[PDB]
């Protein structure tokens, strides 16, 4: 599975397996039981 | 009736070890509380 989307420079710690967050607690939930890699780069010249 | 020790004894014994197991539901052995409640309260699933 490739989630694929967009967020604020931020909460990039917030696509993490457990975490509190308002990124974290309302548009986007991972599992504590998350096996699997999280990539993330820099737009803004997109 | 004015001797019976053996037969004290394992009376004796045996509620001793019976007491030393429920003295032991309330230490820590390194955590917060002795108190499931309390971790479940202070603490998030993670």
Known sequence: ?46 | SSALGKLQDVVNQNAQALNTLVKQLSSNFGAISSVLNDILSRLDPP
């Open chain 1, 1 to 46: 599975y490739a989630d694929s989307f967009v967020i604020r420079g931020d909460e990039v710690r917030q696509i993490a397996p457990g975490q509190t967050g308002k990124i974290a607690d309302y548009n986007y939930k991972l599992p504590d039981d998350f096996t699997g890699c999280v990539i993330a780069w820099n737009s803004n010249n997109l």
